[PDB]
Amino acid sequence: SPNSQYLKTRILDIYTPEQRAGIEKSEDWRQFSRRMDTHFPKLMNELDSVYGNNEALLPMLEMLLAQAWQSYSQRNSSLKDIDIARENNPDWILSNKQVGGVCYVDLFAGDLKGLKDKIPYFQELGLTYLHLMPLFKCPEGKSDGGYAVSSYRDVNPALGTIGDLREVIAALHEAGISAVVDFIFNHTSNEHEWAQRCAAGDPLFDNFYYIFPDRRMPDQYDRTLREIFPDQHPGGFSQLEDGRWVWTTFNSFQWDLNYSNPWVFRAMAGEMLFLANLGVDILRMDAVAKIWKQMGTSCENLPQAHALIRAFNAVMRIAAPAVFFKSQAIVHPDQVVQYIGQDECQIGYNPLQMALLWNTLATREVNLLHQALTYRHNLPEHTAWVNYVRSHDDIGWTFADEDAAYLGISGYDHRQFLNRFFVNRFDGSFARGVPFQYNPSTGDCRVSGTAAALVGLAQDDPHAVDRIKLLYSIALSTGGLPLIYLGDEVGTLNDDDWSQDSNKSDDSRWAHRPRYNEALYAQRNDPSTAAGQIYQDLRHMIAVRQSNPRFDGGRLVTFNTNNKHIIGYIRNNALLAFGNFSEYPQTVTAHTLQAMPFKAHDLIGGKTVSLNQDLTLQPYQVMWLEIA
């Protein structure tokens, strides 16, 4: 039954009495020792519930915490300053000053050096937070856009070196920007040293993955598994050349790590420590839902999965307190929120709000959006949503069917409409998206396409610009950390030649992953062009959000607009937000506006607005009203 003091002397064992004296009197040790006393009990409790009486548990922990000391000992002192800051301010994530951006290093800026050169622009745009897409060594050719990781410790050589990454992170900190990076902890590539060695039968790598002699067990699992990339293969398994089968939730070249082995936790915790010491502020925990497998279940959102993530959290509290987790879970809304906790992932993607933003543009009806913002927005203390419009991924229509039923909506019919609308198979749709993973056996389908393509900008729809403005306004103002897909701010369209690369032709997500459009960025300071209007709008909303404390925190209360086309919510009893999702003008009545002040300044238009009479919003207009 190992404890804090026990492991601390196991750690201090390697030192001679001469250095032990200097170590024990040092601040580094004093801090580590305090943090062990505070957080180790949590680590022990979480791992005990997963690994029980496992023989490997004790020695795994002796090794892991020695590594943790050695990692913290080596940790840059600038980062140790950030550790203390974030320990003492858990709510930094909840500040209205936080605005995020995300890009592919190669597609946006060429390489890590070019990314560093682009930092003055992130400053111009107002970012405090930057997510760099998977930047690690991966298979040449097909790699799932870097999501098949061949090494967590090596940069993708097209991008530069680990030293460049260190340099870039340092420059981002100097510029007041947090560095955000993926921790792809559910699976590695099949080319990872661990995968190669486990498959070869190296006993040190026994049970690093899920490997089977035939179809017997994969057949048992497949009957309860959801299909993630049905285009690629059925179920959750792929066959090796020697005849065996390996768990592959995603592509065949992505092998699911086996977390029922305590050594796998150890291995991945060591890689996590390495990334922490790069100065990474937030790790996007990729596919959090899948890290525990259980026969007879969906192998999604299992209690042990939560417990393991909570264990990973404890390790950071002990050895790099500055590092927070970002949950990536595209599941039922009831399951999305369960990853979000101070002792789990402090922030999480908000795919419900995102999906419903696009839903509401299509139907023009705020019913589902209003419902979601009313019952599913508010979070526990010291946690926040990451609010977004578009990402590197396809759009899944992951609203709750039970929730929809109350508004007289049937799941499939609605999703079929949504899928047809956004892929331009519907009468007069403005959207120019392409299908992704149409599953003929179930009817499920997702949508690829850039924000600009989905709103009608490719064919110069006169409402397109306002649509982008409107969607982003909600992400920026509901409460939580808003994330811009970089390129959106100048209206970057689809790369229509995406499938000409034979390594990209089987994954339509590439359509919404275009290179930096030089011409559009050159027009960002010219308000005449679409790029300039979008840039001016988004830049204006960012500036308002970051300097106005009415936007602070993550809580909201919805406001009943009594118009099916207009969304209403209130921030801090002081900011009233109206968003019209109709291409026609829409009215909030005097009667409905009774409780409000007679006049209010609109932060979007810059006008004073009257609320003692009918308020009429132009097509797609957003108002940000100071009511207190």
Ligand X SMILES: OC[C@H]1O[C@@](CO)(O[C@H]2O[C@H](CO)[C@@H](O)[C@H](O)[C@H]2O)[C@@H](O)[C@@H]1O
Supply the minimum distance, in Å, between the C-beta of residue 396 and ligand X.
6
Q: Does 225 bind Cl ion (CB under 5 A)?
A: no
Q: Does 330 bind Cl ion (CB under 5 A)?
A: yes
Supply the minimum distance, in Å, between the C-beta of residue 508 and ligand X.
3
CA distances from 59 to 50, 183, 268 (A): 16, 25, 16
Considering the complex, state which of residue 102 and residue 177 has its C-beta at the smaller distance from Cl ion.
102
Q: Copy the structure tokens of residue 621.
A: 């207009």
Q: Copy the structure tokens of residue 97.
A: 């000053």
Supply the minimum distance, in Å, between the C-beta of residue 115 and ligand X.
20
3-class DSSP state for residue 511? helix
Q: Does 501 bind ligand X (CB under 6 A)?
A: no
DSSP 317: H
Contact pick of 394, 403, 488, 552 for ligand X (by CB under 6 A)? 394
Q: Does 35 bind ligand X (CB under 6 A)?
A: no
Contact pick of 245, 436, 569, 578 for ligand X (by CB under 6 A)? 436
Which among 62, 75, 61, 60 is positioned nearest to 10, based on CA atoms? 62
Choices 69-77, 221-229, 324-332, 386-394 (CB under 5 A): range interacting with Cl ion: 324-332
Position of minimal CB gap to Cl ion? 330
Q: Does 227 bind ligand X (CB under 6 A)?
A: no
Q: Does 102 bind Cl ion (CB under 5 A)?
A: no
CA distances from 253 to 146, 153, 240, 241, 392 (A): 12, 19, 10, 13, 20
Considering the complex, state which of residue 214 and residue 506 has its C-beta at the smaller distance from ligand X.
506
CA distances from 400 to 437, 554, 566, 586, 615 (A): 20, 22, 21, 28, 32
First CA to last CA distance, the chain:
56
Contacted entry of ligand X, Cl ion, none for residue 403, CB cut-off 5 to 8 Å set by kind:
none
The CA-based diameter of the chain, rounded to the nearest angstrom, is 81
Q: Does 395 bind Cl ion (CB under 5 A)?
A: no
Q: Does 435 bind ligand X (CB under 6 A)?
A: yes
Contact pick of 256, 403, 488, 507 for ligand X (by CB under 6 A)? 507
Binders of ligand X in range 112-131 (CB under 6 A) = none
Considering the complex, state which of residue 330 and residue 457 has its C-beta at the smaller distance from Cl ion.
330
580 φ/ψ angles, rounded to the nearest 5 degrees: -90, 115
Choices 27-35, 297-305, 311-319, 502-510 (CB under 6 A): range interacting with ligand X: 502-510
Supply the minimum distance, in Å, between the C-beta of residue 306 and ligand X.
16
Q: At residue 414, what is the residue type?
A: H
Q: Copy the structure tokens of residue 348.
A: 């999480």
Q: Does 434 bind ligand X (CB under 6 A)?
A: yes
What CA–CA distance (Å, rounded) separates 601 from 610? 9
Q: How many CA atoms lie within 13 A of 196 on its CB side?
A: 7
What CA–CA distance (Å, rounded) separates 104 from 211? 33
Q: Does 253 bind ligand X (CB under 6 A)?
A: no
483 φ/ψ angles, rounded to the nearest 5 degrees: -115, 120
Supply the minimum distance, in Å, between the C-beta of residue 499 and ligand X.
6
Contacted entry of Cl ion, ligand X, none for residue 349, CB cut-off 5 to 8 Å set by kind:
none
Contact pick of 47, 57, 228, 368 for ligand X (by CB under 6 A)? 228
Considering the complex, state which of residue 398 and residue 494 has its C-beta at the smaller distance from Cl ion.
398
Considering the complex, state which of residue 344 and residue 394 has its C-beta at the smaller distance from ligand X.
394
Considering the complex, state which of residue 465 and residue 483 has its C-beta at the smaller distance from Cl ion.
483
Supply the minimum distance, in Å, between the C-beta of residue 291 and ligand X.
11
Q: Is-contact 350 316, C-beta < 8 A? A: no
3-class DSSP state for residue 568? strand
What CA–CA distance (Å, rounded) separates 55 from 306? 22
Binders of ligand X in range 267-306 (CB under 6 A) = 286-287
Contact pick of 28, 231, 365, 602 for ligand X (by CB under 6 A)? 231
Contacted entry of Cl ion, ligand X, none for residue 338, CB cut-off 5 to 8 Å set by kind:
none
Supply the minimum distance, in Å, between the C-beta of residue 587 and ligand X.
38
DSSP 41: H
Considering the complex, state which of residue 106 and residue 466 has its C-beta at the smaller distance from ligand X.
106
Q: Considering only CA atoms, give the Rg of the chain.
A: 25
String of contacts with ligand X for each residue 321-340, x by CB under 6 A: -------x-x----------
Contact pick of 202, 506, 526, 614 for ligand X (by CB under 6 A)? 506
Which among 515, 212, 554, 200 is positioned nearest to 350, based on CA atoms? 554
Residue 13: how many other CB atoms lie within 10 Å: 10
**β-pairing verdict for 282-285 and 178-183:** parallel
Q: Does 352 bind Cl ion (CB under 5 A)?
A: no
Binders of Cl ion in range 253-292 (CB under 5 A) = 289
Beta-bridge partners for 340 = 345
DSSP states of 291-304: S---TTS-SSS-HH
Q: Is-contact 224 235, C-beta < 8 A? A: no
Contacted entry of ligand X, Cl ion, none for residue 438, CB cut-off 5 to 8 Å set by kind:
ligand X
String of contacts with ligand X for each residue 179-198, x by CB under 6 A: -----x--------------
- Contacts with ligand X by CB under 6 A: the residue count is 22
Contacted entry of Cl ion, ligand X, none for residue 535, CB cut-off 5 to 8 Å set by kind:
none
Q: What is the dihedral of CA 190, 195, 197, 199, to 10 degrees?
A: -80
Choices 74-82, 166-174, 214-222, 505-513 (CB under 6 A): range interacting with ligand X: 505-513
Considering the complex, state which of residue 335 and residue 587 has its C-beta at the smaller distance from Cl ion.
335
Instruction: Let me know if 566 is exposed, middle or buried by CB neighbors in 10 A (0-12, 13-18, 19+).
Output: buried
Give the burial string for 404-432 (b: 16+ CB within 10 Å, else e): beeeebeeeebbebbbbbbbbeeeebbbb
Considering the complex, state which of residue 32 and residue 399 has its C-beta at the smaller distance from Cl ion.
399
Which residues are at the interface with Cl ion (CB under 5 A)?
289, 330
Interaction site with ligand X (CB under 6 A): 144, 147, 184, 228, 231, 250, 286-287, 328, 330, 392-394, 434-438, 499, 506-508
